[PDB]
Amino acid sequence: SPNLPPGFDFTDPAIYAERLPVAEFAELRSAAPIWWNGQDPGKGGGFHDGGFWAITKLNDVKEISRHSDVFSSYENGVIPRFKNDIAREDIEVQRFVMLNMDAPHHTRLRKIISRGFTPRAVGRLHDELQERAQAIAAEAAAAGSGDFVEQVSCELPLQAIAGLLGVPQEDRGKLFHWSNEMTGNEDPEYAHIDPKASSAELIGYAMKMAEEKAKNPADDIVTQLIQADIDGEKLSDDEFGFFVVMLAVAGNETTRNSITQGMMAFAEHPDQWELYKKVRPETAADEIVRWATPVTAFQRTALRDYELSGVQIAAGQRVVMFYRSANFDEEVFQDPFTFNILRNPNPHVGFGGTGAHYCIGANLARMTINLIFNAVADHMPDLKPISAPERLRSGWLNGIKHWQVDYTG
Ligand code: HEM
Numbered sequence: 001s002p003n004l005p006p007g008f009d010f011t012d013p014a015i016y017a018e019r020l021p022v023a024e025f026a027e028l029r030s031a032a033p034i035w036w037n038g039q040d041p042g043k044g045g046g047f048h049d050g051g052f053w054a055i056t057k058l059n060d061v062k063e064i065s066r067h068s069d070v071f072s073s074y075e076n077g078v079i080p081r082f083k084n085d086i087a088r089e090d091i092e093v094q095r096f097v098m099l100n101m102d103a104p105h106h107t108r109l110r111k112i113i114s115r116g117f118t119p120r121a122v123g124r125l126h127d128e129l130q131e132r133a134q135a136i137a138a139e140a141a142a143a144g145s146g147d148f149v150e151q152v153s154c155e156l157p158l159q160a161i162a163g164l165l166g167v168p169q170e171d172r173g174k175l176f177h178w179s180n181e182m183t184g185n186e187d188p189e190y191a192h193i194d195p196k197a198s199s200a201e202l203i204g205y206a207m208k209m210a211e212e213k214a215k216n217p218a219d220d221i222v223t224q225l226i227q228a229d230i231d232g233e234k235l236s237d238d239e240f241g242f243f244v245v246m247l248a249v250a251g252n253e254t255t256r257n258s259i260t261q262g263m264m265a266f267a268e269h270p271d272q273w274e275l276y277k278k279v280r281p282e283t284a285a286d287e288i289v290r291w292a293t294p295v296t297a298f299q300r301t302a303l304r305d306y307e308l309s310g311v312q313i314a315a316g317q318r319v320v321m322f323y324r325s326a327n328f329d330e331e332v333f334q335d336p337f338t339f340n341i342l343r344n345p346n347p348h349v350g351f352g353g354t355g356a357h358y359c360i361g362a363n364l365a366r367m368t369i370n371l372i373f374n375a376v377a378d379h380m381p382d383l384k385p386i387s388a389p390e391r392l393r394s395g396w397l398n399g400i401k402h403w404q405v406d407y408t409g
């Protein structure tokens, strides 16, 4: 057996509020790459089936992610942990967003929404995001010190979402408020947030925006999404509203935490930080994502019996892909535990395994990371941390709530 405590759960929020279970992930990769992770009664993060299969190897993650005909996202959602007492109804509302849909409903939705993540559309965000990144850094440096997460990591990913959706300036304040109130409620610091409230307001704003853009068409990404194409396909108003609700999560706390941990990695590896400031290599973004793995894990449900790397997975059983483990697989990376911002190629699964659900925002994310870290180098090159970062209590998100930091040194 793999050497692990009894009653160990890799989706336990208690661990991730403290640390990442890196030694435990390494143990499984070596001794039990696919491992039944049982869960005590009542302690199933919202799922009362007794446990799941841990998936720790990159190739195993990639097999599951491409075989979405077997490994469903609809059946139980992809989030592997909620509050233990969460109602089944609240899990199943996730199916209203593309992420938790299967083919063919996902296939139709992904093809329409692809019209918003063309390389061309993302490039029109470059200039506005670059200028904001620069001012965010200058504003942060001028403060001398403070919470790096709030002052450097927080704002720009939200600007990318708002700029992509063309949200007018005056509306961005409440849009950021709602977007930031969607996850993390298992952490004591956010016990009082109601995601369903903010989501219903997000959908209302998103649907009103889509009604208005129909009446007054433009050359935005919104109007391309709600008016029909060759096949007569388009998002109806509520579907656009579920698209916005998804964007408010999928591209917010993820890029946020990659910026933070990416800076956390440059503190720990001064060699890489000195190198970065000199060459500003855009390969850093991928290494920063591999290092940060903002989504520790996503799950699937096997719709039929399936044999994966010599392990019989039974219909209805859950498999949880631990991207945190896959991104440090010794069989795929030379030195996984070397932060190397020049690593090329870099086949990390930070954006998920390739397949139907592979992150549509991967290139926007990489651009956001590259702009903000260029701005950090321009305005805050001698960044020194004050105190140790404060981790987020979450079973699937690898979050940093706060990080006290001096920008002058
Ligand atoms: C910056 C770090 C990011 C990380 C680590 C990340 C990670 C992921 C992962 C793991 C998936 C699921 C992969 C799979 O199931 O195969 C995903 C899907 C998705 N991501 Fe991201 N993401 C990031 C940024 C973004 C951004 C900036 C956006 C949009 C502005 C975005 C939008 C989406 C959407 C819409 C999906 C659903 C795709 C589908 O189900 O067809 N993500 N992301």
Ligand SMILES: CCOC(=O)c1cc2cc(-c3ccncc3)ccc2n1CC1CCCC1
Binding pocket: 090, 091, 093, 094, 096, 097, 099, 182, 183, 195, 196, 199, 200, 245, 246, 249, 250
């Ligand atoms: C209106 C229907 O949608 C929602 O309420 C909703 C969508 C959603 C998406 C993510 C997500 C996470 C990671 N990468 C992409 C998307 C996370 C949470 C989400 N919730 C709220 C949940 C909290 C408990 C109830 C469900």
